[model samples]
Target: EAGTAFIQTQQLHAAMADTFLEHMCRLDIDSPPITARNTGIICTIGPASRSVETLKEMIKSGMNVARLNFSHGTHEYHAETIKNVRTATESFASDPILYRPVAVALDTKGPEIRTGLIKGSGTAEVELKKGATLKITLDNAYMEKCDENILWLDYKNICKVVEVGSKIYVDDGLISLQVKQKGADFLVTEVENGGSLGSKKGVNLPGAAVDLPAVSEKDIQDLKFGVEQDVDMVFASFIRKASDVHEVRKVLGEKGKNIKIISKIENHEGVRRFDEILEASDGIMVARGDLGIEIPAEKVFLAQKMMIGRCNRAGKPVICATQMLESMIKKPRPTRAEGSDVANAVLDGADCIMLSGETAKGDYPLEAVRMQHLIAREAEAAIYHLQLFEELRRLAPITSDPTEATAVGAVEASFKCCSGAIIVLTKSGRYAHQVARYRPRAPIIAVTRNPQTARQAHLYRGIFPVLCKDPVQEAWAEDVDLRVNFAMNVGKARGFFKKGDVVIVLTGWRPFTNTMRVVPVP
Candidate 1:
């Protein structure tokens, strides 16, 4: 590698200079400029991070998406969180002009079962002794009241669906039960592994052919509520098949059709039918919570890689979620393993890394966000852009679409010339997405007038979408030039590129075979 870093000499072979600069910048006596981060961070908003002040700190710290877990919060409760998010985004007291829009994602409760409340107090706990006979009732009256002798489950057909000798896991498999006898309305089960069971705890029937509707009535109501709230996307939980994605889409209907649906792969069925699910949904989330319960715990990592790689090849967003920084919930710093876990997810080509309980109810919510930001940036920098670009290009089918082909060409040029940034002017954000597929070392600044397109573009890796607020000019050429200049100014302001740095300006000429031109920053 050429070691000379003189601007004049490096300009001759920018690729060599690119390597040298990356190494030199890190060790520079003066603090290096803030490196542009590519991998997105999605933080769950909960009791710990719901306030306007904390939300702003999170956004400032690096939260690109705010996930509302419907497994817990009510619509009105979430409504207040949403309002606070808007207020926090608006009250950009630190930098009023440098506004970043954080997209809201609604995570559905999905079609899962849970036990009814304990008797006396809703939060009361009942200890079930081991080897004891327990009566499971499917009665509506006991929904709000249950004791040690009797337990009510949300699933109505639990008695008919689960066969004798079937194992039931309550509260995330902490307590185990096996059906001794199945009646028409109830089941008599012997507690195999017993513990204190809390109210509204999750219930699982591992390996049982428990058929549940893809979308439940409550999910429908939640989807409607999401539409009313104008949330950007839905993280459909426990998706098992393509049909599940279709059913959620049906619930969204034409009114909420534009809202994105990211299917959560959390079970054996989901892992088995991942291809179809990937094709059906807008994106995918490797939800490892219940997934660990549904399958062998050791195989979860394999499924994560498989799903993430599939999504990468498909050019769709995939999020690695659940317990990424579980220990960080109470501690300010993540365990070394947790750090590597986050880094590996980024390296495995996850478009985003999600924080579940860490940011939702953690003692150090802001620290968690900051730590994730640091980890992702390091992971992004460690990627071998040259080899990665070649491999991705080799894997992709030869493209006939001019836009796509142009993207490939632009990314290739970025590598050879060590471009500072790839400035893409797009309306639907397709061009920026195309460029991202090649995984260029340079950042991709996507400029668009469509606010939704701008916000949603965060789902893709290396896409720093800028919402162009300039008035549309009468001339098409004028508008194009205006957008390009706007993007360049953004890059300059954000420290993506400096004066005299080369950049690739990719844009379309009234559509059809978009143009890719190399320009020196002004």
Candidate 2:
């Protein structure tokens, strides 16, 4: 339906034209230039990717979101990264051609229960063999000693919660130990699989009803920094209950609560309480690293699919995260399994796919980002051409909220009308994000009066978000005349509309009227 590519070729040799003077009419006539890929990629920043060169490459290579892991780095270090990320935005600040604004996400370190401080100075690492036995106690005395056969727990109550044979996972499942016997104040355990255990590494007690708060003192401090920094989003880790999301929201307070809260589901409780968590959260992240250890690795794949579909139905942004391209951390190319994982996430209707170490600490950061971009673009293209995503959207229930209802109605009309494009205006980005959930085939042109909303709106797929002046908001115009003018200008600017083309203009209602404008371009 667009872009007539005239490539006339002969069997073996060239053909001559009959006219005395011949010329090929090789020029773009109607088609809009293909822009950035629709499905967004989130890249974590760290030592390997903080340089201005690497940062700019990540953006130009299709990174739509920049994630700052609160688990590491100091406030001063991250402040520089934030400034550099914003500084990189100036590379694409040229107007009319349209460039996406990168959304920033801060991932908190939840109540990460781990081994306490071990003696032997700064580089203390307790090495153990597969069959060796050691004592794990909640006593502070054990942590202060340099005894080779004893280690202390970070959570003192863990000694009381475990059974005689409960398995303990240490350092993200890198080592496994089983309790051999229970004593008054400690447990004698046999290392089933052993490795060098370092200080403050993560610990997981599967099926033990691990008692820990979702938010920690460290997370509260990090979140305050995030709020002050004004990150676009916050990934609340280890959200076992709905109240956990609310607690973080409360901490964010009125000033920064609007920062999108993405609940990181890393354990069985979070998975079981998915519905309640979705109700309390703005988005979800399949934190597959710890979750793979929490639930059996066999079940995490199915859980990923289930969680992503649930978010789509609930109209919340769901992110597939962790170890997406783990192999690429050292190798230049990713494994086939890694490529399949990224592609499947996109086809599963995930709003975003996250990269943790691949970009943050990997040797091939640019390649990792590029691979995700390629896979997502291919998957999204398939969704549109196969009509597969549309079929899935029809099965998901539409919400009763006015914005969601309007979005659903617009998508339905777009399919029937075969609309050229959809124009939207948003102040808080809620309107555009709601409509994007329905996954319309027509391109979305979003004009906003607020700069932050405009920047955040770029996180949604198929949306061309731009900042524009609002005379009404500025107390100059009587009503939203800028909207009508917007449609006319965008209609021509995008080459998607003619004088008679029917374009859907989504705007706010003043005196309680229809929210959609079904008018033709004039």
lDDT of all predictions: 0.85, 0.76
Which pairs clash in model 1? none
The residue-by-residue lDDT of candidate 2 on 356-382, one tens digit each, is: 899999999999999998777555543
What TM value does model 1 have? 0.89
Q: 183-222, model 1: which lDDT tens digit per residue?
A: 9889999999999988998988888767887688988999
TM-scores for all predictions: 0.89, 0.82
Which segments of candidate 1 are over 4 A away from where they belong?
1-34, 93-97, 127-134, 147-149, 190-195, 509-513
lDDT of 1: 0.85
Error of 2 at 485 (Å): 7.7
Name every residue pair that clashes in candidate 2. Answer: none
